[PDB]
Design a protein around this ligand. Structure first.
Ligand code: H2N
Ligand code: ZN
Length: 299
């Protein structure tokens, strides 16, 4: 049987918001079966809880933001990508501020902290959303698609229109039947271009962004003295973002995602279109893990 998973132990981390630059304390806690992933603003009295679900996404400018009335949890995509990669169904995420800490810009620190704490299998069937029909959303030259697939596969393609790529459209495919999320995706850091500094300053964004927690590009130069973690780090980070954004479905996917310049906004529009088109998907469980089209690492 493929079982639901939670954390075996609590995880505690400190860091800064990429966008806010605020110091934030993070605690991940075990949760019961069918809780899903629930963010808690514990700096507020009373505490404000926001389920990590597509319907609670409020802003998708330069991150995925959860919103309940006036309350936000910004930049959830990198932590949710870690939780999706390791198959965590149920957890409370407590935050002392409005934004998940950026850590090193990747999902690496989160997968390491989680795998250090360990996972706990729970006595309940893991529920999957199985893609049964093709579902496409487009806006301009941006496109995001779900395709039926017996497994979980992500493709991303983007023409960054930026000199640092030396005129090359970036493309990557990962199939979690062979690709290690941990080894091949989790280390891919977020990035910023020095040419967007005017605009980011003007939206009060990326206040915590530096070479410490991101790839920083200035025209031709990667400013980071120690360089890239992957030849294709930039596009592997878009795949990491897409895995986090897709986890707002609230259950792991059986299917394929293809992204064409898609961002947080179009990723969320795809989830909403999918959820509305009930002909395109069904909830499935696997009573026997041996015949399932996906597997997870030992807990
Ligand atoms: C002075 O260093 C900087 C400046 C800006 C950033 C920066 C990062 N981001 C977030 C970038 C995006 C939206 C991302 O990772 N989302 O999860 S991406 C790479 O998909 O386009 C941003 O809006 O600004 C940075 F990381 C470092
Ligand atoms: Zn990102």
């Amino acid at each position: 049987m493929i079982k639901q998973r939670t954390l075996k132990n609590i995880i505690r981390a400190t860091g800064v918001g990429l966008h806010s630059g605020e110091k934030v304390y993070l605690t991940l806690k075990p949760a019961p079966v069918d809780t899903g992933i629930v963010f808690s603003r514990t700096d507020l009295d009373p505490v404000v809880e926001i389920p990590a679900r597509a319907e609670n996404v409020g802003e998708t400018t330069m991150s995925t933001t959860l919103v309940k009335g006036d309350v936000k949890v910004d930049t959830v995509e990198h932590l949710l990508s870690a939780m999706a990669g390791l198959g965590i169904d149920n957890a409370y995420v407590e935050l002392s501020a409005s934004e998940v800490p950026i850590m090193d810009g990747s999902a690496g620190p989160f997968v390491f902290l989680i795998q250090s704490a360990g996972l706990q299998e729970q006595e309940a069937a893991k529920k999957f959303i199985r893609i049964k029909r093709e579902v496409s959303v487009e806006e301009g030259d941006k496109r995001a698609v779900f395709v039926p697939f017996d497994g979980f596969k992500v493709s991303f393609e983007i023409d960054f229109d930026h000199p640092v790529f030396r005129g090359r459209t970036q493309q990557a495919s990962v199939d979690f039947s062979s690709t290690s999320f941990v080894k091949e995706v989790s280390r891919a850091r977020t990035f910023g271009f020095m040419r967007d500094i005017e605009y980011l300053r003007s939206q009060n964004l990326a206040l915590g962004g530096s070479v410490e927690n991101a790839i920083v590009v200035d025209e031709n130069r990667v400013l980071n003295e120690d360089g890239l973690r992957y030849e294709d780090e930039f596009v592997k980070h878009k795949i990491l973002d897409a895995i986090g954004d897709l986890y707002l479905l609230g259950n792991s996917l059986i299917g394929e995602f293809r992204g064409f310049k898609s961002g947080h906004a179009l990723n969320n529009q795809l989830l909403r279109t999918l959820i509305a088109d009930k002909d395109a998907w069904e909830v499935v469980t696997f009573e026997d893990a041996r015949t399932a089209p996906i597997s997870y690492m030992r807990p």
